[PDB]
Amino acid sequence: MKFPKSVNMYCPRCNTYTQHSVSNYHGGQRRSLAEGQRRYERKLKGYGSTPKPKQKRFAKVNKKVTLVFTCTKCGYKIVKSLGRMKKVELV
Amino acid sequence: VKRTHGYRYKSRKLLSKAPRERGMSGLSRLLYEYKPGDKVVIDIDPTFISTAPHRRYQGKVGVVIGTRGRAYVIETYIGDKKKIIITTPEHLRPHLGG
RNA sequence: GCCCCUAACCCGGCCAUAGGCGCCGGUGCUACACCCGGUCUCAUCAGAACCCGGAAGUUAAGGCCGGCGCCGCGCUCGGGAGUACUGGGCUCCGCGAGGGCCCGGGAAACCGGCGUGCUGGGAGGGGGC
RNA sequence: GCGGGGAAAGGAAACAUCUUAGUACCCGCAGGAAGGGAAGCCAACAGGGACCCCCUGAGUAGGGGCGACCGAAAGGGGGAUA
RNA sequence: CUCGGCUUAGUUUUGCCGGGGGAACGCGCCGGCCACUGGCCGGCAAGGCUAAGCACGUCCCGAGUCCGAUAGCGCACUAGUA
RNA sequence: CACGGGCCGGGGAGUUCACGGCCGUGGCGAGCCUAAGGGGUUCAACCCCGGAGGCGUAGGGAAACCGACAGCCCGCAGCGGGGCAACCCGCGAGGGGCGGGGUCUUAAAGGGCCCGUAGUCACGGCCGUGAGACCAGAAACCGGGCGAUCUAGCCCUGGGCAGG
RNA sequence: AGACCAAUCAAGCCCGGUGAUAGCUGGUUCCCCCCGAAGCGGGUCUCAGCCCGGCCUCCCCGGAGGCGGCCGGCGGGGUAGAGUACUGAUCGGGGCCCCGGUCAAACUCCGAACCUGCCAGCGCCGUAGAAGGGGGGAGGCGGGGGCGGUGGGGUAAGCCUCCGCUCCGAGACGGGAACAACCGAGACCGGGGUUAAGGCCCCCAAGUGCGGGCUUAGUGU
RNA sequence: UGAAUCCUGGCCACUGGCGGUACGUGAACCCCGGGUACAACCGGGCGAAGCGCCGCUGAAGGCCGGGGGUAACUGACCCU
RNA sequence: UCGUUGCGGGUCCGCUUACCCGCCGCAAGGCGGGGACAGCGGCAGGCGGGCUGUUCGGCUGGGGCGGCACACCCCUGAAAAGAUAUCGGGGGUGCCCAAAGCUCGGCUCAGGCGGGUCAGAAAUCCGCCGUAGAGUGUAAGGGCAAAAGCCGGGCUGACUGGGCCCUUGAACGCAAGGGGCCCAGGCGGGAAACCGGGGCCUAGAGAACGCUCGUGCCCCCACCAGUGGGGGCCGGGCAUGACAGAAAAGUUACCCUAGGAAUAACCGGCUCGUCGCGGGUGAGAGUCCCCAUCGACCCCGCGGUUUGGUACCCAGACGUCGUCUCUUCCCAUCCUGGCGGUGCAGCAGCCGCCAAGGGUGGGGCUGCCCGCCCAUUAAAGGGGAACGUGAGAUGGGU
Ligand SMILES: [Mg+2]
Ligand SMILES: [Mg+2]
Ligand SMILES: [Mg+2]
Ligand SMILES: [Mg+2]
Ligand SMILES: [Mg+2]
Ligand SMILES: [Mg+2]
Ligand SMILES: [Mg+2]
Ligand SMILES: [Mg+2]
Ligand SMILES: [Mg+2]
Ligand SMILES: [Mg+2]
Ligand SMILES: [Mg+2]
Ligand SMILES: [Mg+2]
Ligand SMILES: [Mg+2]
Ligand SMILES: [Mg+2]
Ligand SMILES: [Mg+2]
Ligand SMILES: [Mg+2]
Ligand SMILES: [Mg+2]
Ligand SMILES: [Mg+2]
Ligand SMILES: [Mg+2]
Ligand SMILES: [Mg+2]
Ligand SMILES: [Mg+2]
Ligand SMILES: [Mg+2]
Ligand SMILES: [Mg+2]
Ligand SMILES: [Mg+2]
Ligand SMILES: [Mg+2]
Ligand SMILES: [Mg+2]
Ligand SMILES: [Mg+2]
Ligand SMILES: [Mg+2]
Ligand SMILES: [Mg+2]
Ligand SMILES: [Mg+2]
Ligand SMILES: [Mg+2]
Ligand SMILES: [Mg+2]
Ligand SMILES: [Mg+2]
Ligand SMILES: [Mg+2]
Ligand SMILES: [Mg+2]
Ligand SMILES: [Mg+2]
Ligand SMILES: [Mg+2]
Ligand SMILES: [Mg+2]
Ligand SMILES: [Mg+2]
Ligand SMILES: [Mg+2]
Ligand SMILES: [Mg+2]
Ligand SMILES: [Mg+2]
Ligand SMILES: [Mg+2]
Ligand SMILES: [Mg+2]
Ligand SMILES: [Mg+2]
Ligand SMILES: [Mg+2]
Ligand SMILES: [Mg+2]
Ligand SMILES: [Mg+2]
Ligand SMILES: [Mg+2]
Ligand SMILES: [Mg+2]
Ligand SMILES: [Mg+2]
Ligand SMILES: [Mg+2]
Ligand SMILES: [Mg+2]
Ligand SMILES: [Mg+2]
Ligand SMILES: [Mg+2]
Ligand SMILES: [Mg+2]
Ligand SMILES: [Mg+2]
Ligand SMILES: [Mg+2]
Ligand SMILES: [Mg+2]
Ligand SMILES: [Mg+2]
Ligand SMILES: [Mg+2]
Ligand SMILES: [Mg+2]
Ligand SMILES: [Zn+2]
């Protein structure tokens, strides 16, 4: 499905409708100082089996389309999902 | 296979209309101003099915408790449980038995 | 200002007894139309339509009313028919699938007959308070 | 009693991290007890004042397929007091 | 300080062992739940001892809503015997 | 024609602790109880002391932080009035509802939790969880020790195999 | 040859961890009295287990209504049947239409019996306590028989899987020749009487009972 | 593999082993840059074996079909 | 790769004392060679069933293979309230669409007919008819005609913060998801009414921990303040399809434990599709002539003599094929007795009826049963008895 690169959308910070640029959400890189990550390094030290489950069977074919909308006035970012479907083409 | 339970899962005969009742339905049911305390019959209109109550409430009698914008809040029972139906007047009729 | 009666007009309710085909009429001061033009508001390829301004003509058509035939339709009417089917009981029949009896309910098609919009509010018109 | 080496069964309704458990068991070394013991402490700007053991703090903080389960310390009350 | 490992409630923060690196000096050094900076507070590691108050039961003494010879310790007896 | 028992005697199975819920009673009551321990005793009993601590009295929120009722209505019992009575009337603890308040979220409204009193200590009972956990029952797995008089293999050193 | 390693070997033996665990199997000890189930729904590495509801029992609060039956008023439905008009199948006659004919779990103009919602009443239950609510303890979560839905499936099955009443499980007793659930019927103890189902020639209590007709096959009882 | 005797055919695609120029990838260490009054942290570089890639090996484990038709079953034909 | 690892010289060369290897010697020490390499310790990558621990789901007309009836949706089953199962029947789902979403307005669709240059069955044009016979993304069912369809104009409500209700989940506990009615903020369409929190309706759906992103003049981090960093509350996402969510391959005939008739194999029970046997019919054959002898197409039965279906009993156990031995029973009769028919001249043969007293044998082949064959014979029938009979045998097969 095709999506426009800019929309007119309500802004909670501005309390009105402003132009929003449309981009694809990209997940951040996992940082080594995250608390769960630090715990996972502590578990990984020493002898033993693999200490955590790793998924081997997957069933989802597509991920939910997560898009990022940025207000052109203040910079407020809204992240909305369009539902599980193939990757949109920003147009 | 066990019964599927969609919101309208055995509604072929319920939602069907005879040939003489085809098309738009009359607007007289929109013009009944129900108060709190009056008795109404839940009679589902197949042409406005998006706002209709479930098939289990067809033919049942409730008590108008109030209005929510344009819908009527109706108190009814299913066997022993007290249910709250919020439907527009197009799926209602006045009860003339008491 | 008020109560009463009353066409065609406006707003409805039920949405064919209201629909469809054909035939024979009535209606014209007012009202409804057809009708006459496109300066203005408004519109399209097109003043056909929509919108605007009007009043020479016409009941030819639409509308409304009356009658007849056909199709369709409606009926709490007669026959079909207490039939088909059915709730309850049975040490009642049948090899059996099934059927019978008693108590209680009870159609449909079809055939014949009848009917072919009814009605609410307002305008206009008449009467009286 | 002190130091070191060190499981599994079972539990988690499977099982590997985990628990069981620093346990069973093994090796070494003492005493009538052992070990600990005299602030490079705890606290919070108010003060405690070596140590051990008992009651409590407390299944609290926290650890943990944050699951099962595991789990203090300071402080307070005592025995005794060097 | 860093890497590996065992352990600990110790969690970017317990203790330790191993490999590698590696101070300062009382004008110094250490601690105050991640690190550093400033203040403030508390202290002086890497040397040794220490009674009392606490565990145990071969053994001795006393007690018992304990058992009473198939019970109670395996053994009431020429039982750790045949 | 499912399995167990030849017979008789004796033996033979819901225990205890900790924690939690609840019940039946008892004490005290906006408070309740002491733990360890201490003194005395006719000496594990008993009397006295010991309030540390635990639970309750206030909740909301992740946290910083903030921190609460007698107003109204319905109404059982009960009470008072009437009535021959039936019943009617008024007040009405407890109960129900509404309102008001404390706090969180929100821009707000709305919404969540809480608020106008009862706890606590004990004894007996039931149940849950752990502990062996009503009694009996594996095949297994791990730790430390024992075994090559048997047997498998090999090494050192002896004996044996008529007759054709 | 997975042979043998002290009657032990697809990994010895002894003692210990250890009373290992066991949703599985066996056993589980005195009397009387009151009430009295279930094998259904959902979830679960769930299908021989367990949890949340339904069904049981006990206690308490609550306070006047309740509903396995019936009549009526006002409503809902789309089955049996019916039809062949929508969607389809299907045989003939006549000129894409008309007429007659055969069908439909996944066709429907019509349409019961019946079931179900509210109200009023009758009936019964209820202040010796309806509705509603709280607390404890469960069992049980394998069901089965008869009848009815031509239930749906299957050649059929004492077959598989649903729906409802009743009965057995957990219910004595009479009849059925025996026989959990077929008919009658619901049992504190003793006695007397009368009946139910069914029976009355003997076995066996009660009739070689009554009228009419049929059967010659010991058909049948 | 299993006396002796006559013999032991084609195939390295796969599973292995082994050898190899370059190149890609490839851990720690180390180095560079950023960040941090210091660290944690973040980006990059270098880059062993091995893997990828290239060969050799069947008395290594072994494998050994077809499609067809043409052809006067096919000697022969195209090969695929 | 870090250390061992040293001494000279210009990363490379050399040296010996380290270290290592052998020889001699009780040792002391000497000889030779290698040499800061090697070897050794730590760390890191690779190969690594050599060894250690484990997992190898469920439903199921027994298990297995298959299927997914394992999470969902529509029609039917379903018995006119509600609910309702089977490895029941017909199908679909894990999407797609910036327009196929919102609103406003105009129009009318399939198809048919008449007229019209190219032009035609079908293009664009004029008119008449046209109940939807079209279209509405996608299964099925439902809805829809000045529309819910087609065309055009203007937009992004597929919106921010919240509440209530319905369904999933009947009465009656209980996720996620989905739908409805609203309050506030700010918009779009429209004259307004009114509508818009995706698709006309019923499917397209995912807990805890962890990570990531957005958001707040936001809260916390241990004596105080600051910097970096970390944690928290609210919301979107990354996934468990076995879809109320473990991270998981075989084999055992060498096998072991606990149970189970909740569940198969043998026998038994029920059933009889299959198997064997009987009957009705008579097209047709039989020189003519249905029925001497048959018997198409069809139909009604019986037995329990094959095979299956079911899973009622039996897993602390009913000894699994055949044969030998021995006894009895049935008749649906192969011979022997009686009778009839004939397409019965005789000899023979074929068919039916009564009849179970007696007989029904000897060999070759195969573990067989069965079947075929050989020479005879009056003929060399077939079945039941826990597929009679293993506390009688045998042991060829399995
Ligand atoms: Mg269900
Ligand atoms: Mg919608
Ligand atoms: Mg144990
Ligand atoms: Mg386990
Ligand atoms: Mg296990
Ligand atoms: Mg000694
Ligand atoms: Mg001492
Ligand atoms: Mg000492
Ligand atoms: Mg521990
Ligand atoms: Mg004695
Ligand atoms: Mg003794
Ligand atoms: Mg048994
Ligand atoms: Mg016995
Ligand atoms: Mg337990
Ligand atoms: Mg194990
Ligand atoms: Mg061992
Ligand atoms: Mg020997
Ligand atoms: Mg073998
Ligand atoms: Mg042996
Ligand atoms: Mg072994
Ligand atoms: Mg042992
Ligand atoms: Mg009773
Ligand atoms: Mg059992
Ligand atoms: Mg009624
Ligand atoms: Mg029918
Ligand atoms: Mg019919
Ligand atoms: Mg019904
Ligand atoms: Mg069951
Ligand atoms: Mg039944
Ligand atoms: Mg039972
Ligand atoms: Mg009897
Ligand atoms: Mg008698
Ligand atoms: Mg007879
Ligand atoms: Mg070869
Ligand atoms: Mg070296
Ligand atoms: Mg090395
Ligand atoms: Mg292995
Ligand atoms: Mg699995
Ligand atoms: Mg299974
Ligand atoms: Mg399968
Ligand atoms: Mg229904
Ligand atoms: Mg429209
Ligand atoms: Mg569900
Ligand atoms: Mg329910
Ligand atoms: Mg759709
Ligand atoms: Mg869904
Ligand atoms: Mg502090
Ligand atoms: Mg599930
Ligand atoms: Mg069975
Ligand atoms: Mg059998
Ligand atoms: Mg047959
Ligand atoms: Mg014949
Ligand atoms: Mg059979
Ligand atoms: Mg039996
Ligand atoms: Mg037996
Ligand atoms: Mg036996
Ligand atoms: Mg005969
Ligand atoms: Mg047998
Ligand atoms: Mg036999
Ligand atoms: Mg035998
Ligand atoms: Mg025998
Ligand atoms: Mg043999
Ligand atoms: Zn903005």
Which string of DSSP letters, residue by residue, matches B33-51? -PPTT-EEEE---GGGGGG
CA distances from B35 to A31, A41, B40, B76 (A): 62, 67, 11, 16
Q: Would the Cβ of B20 be found within 7 angstroms of any atom in strand C?
A: yes
Please name which of B82, B87, B48, B91 lies closest in space to residue B66, comparing C-alpha atoms: B87
CA distance B87 to B90: 8
Asked if B91 contacts B85 with a C-beta cutoff of 8 angstroms, the reply is no
Q: Could you say which DSSP state residue A76 is in?
A: -
Write the CB contacts of A20 (distance below 8 Å, at least 6 apart in sequence). Answer: A6, A7, A8, A9, A11, A69, A70, A71, A72, A78
Q: Could you say which DSSP state residue A43 is in?
A: H
What approach was used to elucidate this structure? cryo-EM
Q: Which nucleotides of H are covered by protein (CB under 7 A)?
A: 40-43
Rg (CA), chain B: 14
Q: Which nucleotides of I are covered by protein (CB under 7 A)?
A: 53, 69-70, 72-78, 81-89, 94-99, 131, 141-145, 148, 155-161, 163-173, 178-183, 185-187, 195, 198-206, 209-216, 229-232, 235-242, 246-249
Q: Would the Cβ of B84 be found within 7 angstroms of any atom in strand I?
A: yes
CA distance B59 to B43: 6
Q: Would the Cβ of B61 be found within 7 angstroms of any atom in strand G?
A: yes
Q: Which nucleotides of C are covered by protein (CB under 7 A)?
A: 12-16, 74
Residue with the two structure tokens 């299913």: B78
3-state secondary structure of B27: helix
